[PDB]
Design a protein that fits this description.
homodimer; about 375 residues; alpha/beta; Rossmann fold; Dihydrodipicolinate Reductase, domain 2; Alpha-Beta Plaits; ten-stranded mixed beta sheet; six-stranded parallel beta sheet; 16 strands; oxidoreductase; Aspartic acid pathway
C-alpha cells in the first residue's frame, strides 16, 4: 500500500506522544486511509539520555541524515528553538517536504517566512500552536484579550484569594511546580507576549515583533492594588491584548483591571483564556494544550496533509496632601474631557482613580501638575 | 478551465436567502481563486408565487422536490428547509443518488445525523451538518432562557415579568415554550452527546425541566448560598451509558459557567486526562449559519476526486457524586432543627448547608450524595417543593 515516510525532529513529551498515537492508530490509518505511516528517523539531541521507553525507531543525532533523505514525505518538528531549528525547516521546505511543527518558540516573523517558503515550493506548512486549550483554530477580528500565562495568573489568583504578597504567592507557585526557579519568563510577561505575537498574526494577518509588545509583568502588583480594584468592582489579571485599528496592531501585556462581570474576570489559577471581539464576543477557556493533545493535533494534521475606542485607566497617586474630595476636584480640573471618574483611598496620603474615556494615559499630565504617580494600569470590560 | 459546481437549495427562509446572497457577493472570488463556478440551479420553496426580492426571482424556483432529486447534473444539495418528514427522506434519496449534502436543518436529532452520515459514507459522498475522551459536558444552550434568568437575577423581577421583557426585546418569541420549557436545549444536548460521545440518544431520553418554575426566591436564596441559577444541558458518559438532562441548576459563582449572562451560550467540557475547557459565544444568527453553509460548500468543492476517530493510549504517566438544592415547605420548628434532622436522615455526604427560603420554608444544599434525597426527605414527613442539581466545586 502507499507508504508515508516521515521523520520527527525532537522526542520530548510531545514527540513521544506523536509516536504512541501513530502506533496505536497505525492499523486504522492503514485499514481505512490506505496509507502506511513509517517513522523512518527521529532526531534527538542526545541519544544516550532517557525517555518517555526503549523502542524500535531509528534515532539519530545528525539532522543532515534526515534533511538529505529524499524518501521522506513529511517532517514533523517538535524540537523547539529558533536557531538552528528554523533553518532546518527552511531546508525541508526547499527540498519539497511538507512540514508540521509544534515549535513553541516560533514567532510571527518565523511563521510567515515558513508559510511563504512552503507555498513557494508547493508543500504544506501546518503550525500547531496552543495558547488556551486547545489550539487556534481561532472574521474580522478587531480586538482580542487573553490570559495567556498560567503561572502569572496562578500567582494573582493566590494573592487575591489567600491575601498574600506577591513574594509569598510566587514561592508557593515555585513549591507546586507552577513557577520555575527563575520565573522571569512567566512573571515578566514574556511568555504571554510571545502568545500575543502569534495570536496577532493569526487574528490580523500582521507580523509584529516580540519587542513591539508593550510589556509589563506582575511583580509590582500588590495586595493593595488587588483590594482597591476589588472594591471598585474589578479583578486584576495579566492581560495580553491586541487591537487592530487603521492598519496598525497595538499589542501589549500588562496588569489590567478587569470588570468582575467580564468572562475573563472569572479565569483563575493556571487556566487561560482568549476573548475575541469582532458579531458577538467569543471566548475559549482552558489550561492550554498538553503534550497529548498537541500530539493529537500533529497526527491529525499529518493525516490531512496525507489526504491531499477610548481607553480607561487606574491611576495610583501618592504623597497627596489634603482630602480625597480635594484630590477628586483637582483631577476633575486637570484631566482633559472624559466620561467618568471615581476615586478611592489607596494608602496613607495615597489615592487611586479609575478614569473612563481618555485617549491616552494621564500619567505624564498628572506628573506635570506636581503629583507623584506611582503607576497606571489599564482598565477593561467597562460596560 | 473552470468547472461548474451545480447546486440546489431546499428552502428559502432567512438562512437560505443568506446563503444565496453570500454566494452572489463571493461568486467572482470563488471563481477567480478556487477555479470553480457555483451555479444555483434550483431553489425549492413551499410557495413559488409569493413576492420576493428581485435577486431571488432570477433563480429557478420550484415547488417540486423531485425536479431537484432527479437532476443528475447536481453536485451538491443544500438543505435549509427544516422538518424531519419528509426532509430526511429527501436527503436519503440525494445521498443514494451520489449527491453531497449540506444541511442546516435545526430539527435533526442524533438518530437522523447517524443514519445520514452512514448513508453518505456508504455512497462515497460528504454530509456536512451545521445544525478527546470527553466524559462530561455542561452547557448553557438556549439564549432566551438564560436571558430570562439573568434579568430575574440582575433586576429582581419575577419569571413572568422577565419573560415579558424578553418578548419585548425580541429574545423570546410570542410562543416561547420551546425556549422556556428547555426543549431547544434538550435537542442541543442530544446533538452534543452525539458529537461528544458518539452515542445516539433520543430526545425523550433527556430528562427535562424548564425555567418557568424558577422564582426570585430561588435565585436570592441560591445567591446567599454562593450560587447562580442557570438552565444547564448536561451529558455524562459513564460505563457505556449517556445520562442526559436539561434543568434549572445551581452553579457555584466561581465556576466559569456562572459568569455566562444574558443571551450568551457556553459549553463546558470535561475530559479524563486534560484540563476543563469552555467555549463561549452567542447562538448563530441566519447570516452566520449561511456563512457556515457556504464554507462547507467550498470545502466539499475540494472533494473533487475519509472518516476516523484517533484513539489514544496514555503511557504519558469511583462514580462522581451528585449535589442537590432541596426546598422544603410547611416546616414547623427552627432552621437548626431542620438542619439536625437532615444530618440524621441523609446518607453519607460531604457537606450540608441550610438557609431560610420563606415562611415555614427552608432550603438545603447537600454536596456528595450518591442520589437525590427527595424521596427520603418526603418519607420523613417533609413537603418537598423542588430539588435542583448543584454544580461546580472544590
Amino acid at each position: 500500500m502507499k507508504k508515508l515516510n516521515i521523520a520527527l525532529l525532537g522526542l520530548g513529551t510531545v514527540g513521544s506522544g506523536v509516536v504512541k498515537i501513530i502506533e496505536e492508530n497505525r492499523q486504522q490509518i492503514q485499514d481505512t486511509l490506505n496509507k502506511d505511516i513509517v517513522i523512518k528517523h527521529i532526531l534527538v539531541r542526545d541519544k544516550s539520555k532517557k525517555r518517555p521507553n526503549i523502542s524500535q525507531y531509528h534515532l539519530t543525532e545528525d539532522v543532515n541524515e534526515i534533511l538529505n533523505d529524499d524518501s521522506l514525505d513529511i517532517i514533523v518538528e517538535v524540537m523547539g528553538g529558533i536557531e538552528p531549528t528554523v533553518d532546518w525547516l527552511r531546508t525541508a521546505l526547499k527540498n519539497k517536504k511538507h512540514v508540521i511543527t509544534a515549535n513553541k518558540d516560533l514567532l510571527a516573523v518565523h511563521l510567515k517566512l515558513l508559510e511563504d517558503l512552503a507555498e513557494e515550493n508547493g508543500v504544506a506548512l501546518k503550525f500547531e500552536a496552543s495558547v488556551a486549550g486547545g489550539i487556534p483554530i481561532v472574521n474580522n477580528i478587531s480586538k482580542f484579550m487573553g490570559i495567556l500565562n498560567g503561572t502569572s495568573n496562578f500567582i494573582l489568583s493566590k494573592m487575591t484569594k489567600e491575601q498574600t504578597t506577591f513574594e509569598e504567592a510566587l514561592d508557593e507557585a515555585k513549591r507546586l511546580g507552577f513557577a520555575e526557579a527563575d520565573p522571569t519568563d512567566d512573571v515578566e510577561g514574556v511568555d504571554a507576549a510571545r502568545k500575543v505575537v502569534i495570536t496577532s498574526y493569526l487574528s490580523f494577518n500582521q507580523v509584529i515583533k516580540l519587542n513591539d509588545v508593550k510589556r509589563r509583568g506582575i511583580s509590582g502588583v500588590t495586595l493593595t492594588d488587588i483590594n482597591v480594584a476589588d472594591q471598585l468592582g474589578y479583578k486584576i489579571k495579566l492581560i495580553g491584548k491586541g487591537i487592530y485599528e487603521n492598519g496598525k496592531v497595538n499589542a501589549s501585556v500588562e496588569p489590567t483591571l478587569i470588570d468582575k462581570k467580564h468572562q475573563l474576570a472569572a479565569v483563575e489559577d493556571e487556566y487561560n483564556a482568549i476573548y475575541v471581539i469582532g458579531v458577538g464576543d467569543t471566548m475559549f477557556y482552558g489550561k492550554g494544550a498538553g503534550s497529548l493533545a498537541t500530539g493529537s493535533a500533529v497526527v491529525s494534521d499529518l493525516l490531512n496533509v496525507a489526504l491531499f475606542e477610548k481607553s480607561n485607566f487606574f491611576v495610583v497617586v501618592n504623597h497627596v496632601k489634603g482630602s480625597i474630595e480635594n484630590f477628586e476636584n483637582e483631577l476633575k480640573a486637570i484631566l482633559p474631557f472624559h466620561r467618568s471618574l471615581r476615586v478611592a483611598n489607596y494608602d496613607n496620603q495615597s489615592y487611586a482613580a479609575v478614569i473612563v474615556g481618555l485617549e491616552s494615559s494621564p500619567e505624564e499630565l498628572i506628573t506635570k501638575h506636581g503629583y507623584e504617580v506611582d503607576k497606571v494600569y489599564p482598565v477593561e470590560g467597562v460596560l
